[PDB]
Amino acid sequence: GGTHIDLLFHPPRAHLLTIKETIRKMIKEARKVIALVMDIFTDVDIFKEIVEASTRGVSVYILLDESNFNHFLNMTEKQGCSVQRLRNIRVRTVKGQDYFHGKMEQKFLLVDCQKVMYGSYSYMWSFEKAHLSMVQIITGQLVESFDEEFRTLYARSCVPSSFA
Amino acid sequence: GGTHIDLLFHPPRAHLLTIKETIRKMIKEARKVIALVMDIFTDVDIFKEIVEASTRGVSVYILLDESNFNHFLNMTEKQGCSVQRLRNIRVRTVKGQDYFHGKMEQKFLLVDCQKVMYGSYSYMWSFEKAHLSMVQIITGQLVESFDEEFRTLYARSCVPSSFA
Numbered sequence: 001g002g003t004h005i006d007l008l009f010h011p012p013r014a015h016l017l018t019i020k021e022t023i024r025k026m027i028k029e030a031r032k033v034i035a036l037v038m039d040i041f042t043d044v045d046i047f048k049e050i051v052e053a054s055t056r057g058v059s060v061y062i063l064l065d066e067s068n069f070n071h072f073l074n075m076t077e078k079q080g081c082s083v084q085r086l087r088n089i090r091v092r093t094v095k096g097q098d099y100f101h102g103k104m105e106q107k108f109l110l111v112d113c114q115k116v117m118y119g120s121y122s123y124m125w126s127f128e129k130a131h132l133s134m135v136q137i138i139t140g141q142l143v144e145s146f147d148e149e150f151r152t153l154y155a156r157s158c159v160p161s162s163f164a
Numbered sequence: 165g166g167t168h169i170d171l172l173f174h175p176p177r178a179h180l181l182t183i184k185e186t187i188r189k190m191i192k193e194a195r196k197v198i199a200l201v202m203d204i205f206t207d208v209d210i211f212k213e214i215v216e217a218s219t220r221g222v223s224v225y226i227l228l229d230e231s232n233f234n235h236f237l238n239m240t241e242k243q244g245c246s247v248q249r250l251r252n253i254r255v256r257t258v259k260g261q262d263y264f265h266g267k268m269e270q271k272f273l274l275v276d277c278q279k280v281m282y283g284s285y286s287y288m289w290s291f292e293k294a295h296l297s298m299v300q301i302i303t304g305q306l307v308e309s310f311d312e313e314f315r316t317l318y319a320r321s322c323v324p325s326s327f328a
């Protein structure tokens with residue numbers, strides 16, 4: 001029981017799918033649980049995929065950096081898709097130490113305790129159109145460490161102010 | 165010939181050294197080559213460690229995101245340590261597509277083609293004092309993929325404007 005890792009790139013290099021298509025595919029194929037940790041989440045296509053997973057019965061847990069959470073909120077309002085009236089999705093924020101706002105600079109997508117996407121790709125249009133990035137697709141034993149990290153971050157997260 | 169990965173955290177969790185102490189240690193123990201890919205590099209302690217490696221005879225290659233390269237330049241000026249009169253260090257910039265500046269959102273430290281630190285820790289004071297982050301220490305076969313990525317990024321890099 002070891003670990004397997006493949007690298008994907010943006011723009012793509014020697015693989016067939018873009019990182020975004022891979023994210024959308026990983027979400028489409030979720031059966032049970034999506035755990036997501038993200039610094040900025042404004043990408044509407046990835047959001048729609050997540051909402052769709054939630055309607056299928058997949059439990060979705062999202063931890064967002066506090067300082068950027070408004071951008072996600074704005075986007076869900078645009079999409080006419082309040083995350084509070086979506087039963088299967090739960091969202092909390094994570095912050096670092098203030099001095100200047102400290103941030104959660106972590107991101108990864110952890111699906112069905114089976115597969116992780118970890119890297120520098122944030123869920124924003126600029127990462128499709130403008131930025132160079134890279135991710136790892138991880139399976140095997142190291143996925144349990146991402147599971148543990150997700151739980152550790154959740155334990156230090158807060159209910160976003162917005163939410164009543 | 166497989167791959168080994170350990171995780172480090174900031175703030176630290178179940179390991180003795182901080183990520184920064186680990187970065188400084190990895191640089192101290194470099195024998196031959198440092199290859200560094202960084203989005204923002206303003207941390208003076210890590211810089212001093214790199215300069216010191218260079219004086220020992222270690223070849224140092226640094227690829228920085230173009231849009232933030234001025235912050236690195238500013239810092240080297242403050243430190244009275246021009247990277248152009250340092251024989252063993254070479255620095256080029258990498259950019260993404262413009263629309264709004266596209267960025268190289270990649271970072272990793274690759275020492276002696278043996279060990280990689282990959283994760284969300286940027287070489288700035290805020291990552292010591294303020295932000296939550298995580299890295300992987302990688303050895304074994306996957307290190308060759310970081311070597312290849314470093315070379316691919318170098319091939320798409322430019323001489324920084326500043327430099328004559």
Ligand SMILES: Fc1ccc(Cn2cnc3ccccc32)cc1
Pocket residue numbers: 061062063090091092150151154
């Ligand atoms: F492992 C866990 C799985 C679910 C919860 C409960 N929960 C509620 N909202 C959440 C947001 C992000 C993450 C978790 C969340 C706790 C731990």
Ligand SMILES: Fc1ccc(Cn2cnc3ccccc32)cc1
Pocket residue numbers: 010011012018128129130131132260261266
């Ligand atoms: F799959 C794609 C392949 C190429 C592009 C457009 N493009 C070309 N070079 C790029 C560098 C960074 C970011 C985007 C880039 C978008 C999607």
Ligand SMILES: Fc1ccc(Cn2cnc3ccccc32)cc1
Pocket residue numbers: 225226227254255256314315318
């Ligand atoms: F693998 C390579 C190792 C060194 C060079 C030559 N070079 C000169 N400046 C550099 C900056 C960053 C990286 C490389 C650099 C090319 C390829």
Ligand SMILES: Fc1ccc(Cn2cnc3ccccc32)cc1
Pocket residue numbers: 096097102174175176182292293294295296
């Ligand atoms: F090794 C260290 C251990 C703790 C601190 C100070 N601190 C405490 N909690 C933090 C969260 C995010 C960032 C810094 C933090 C600095 C260095």
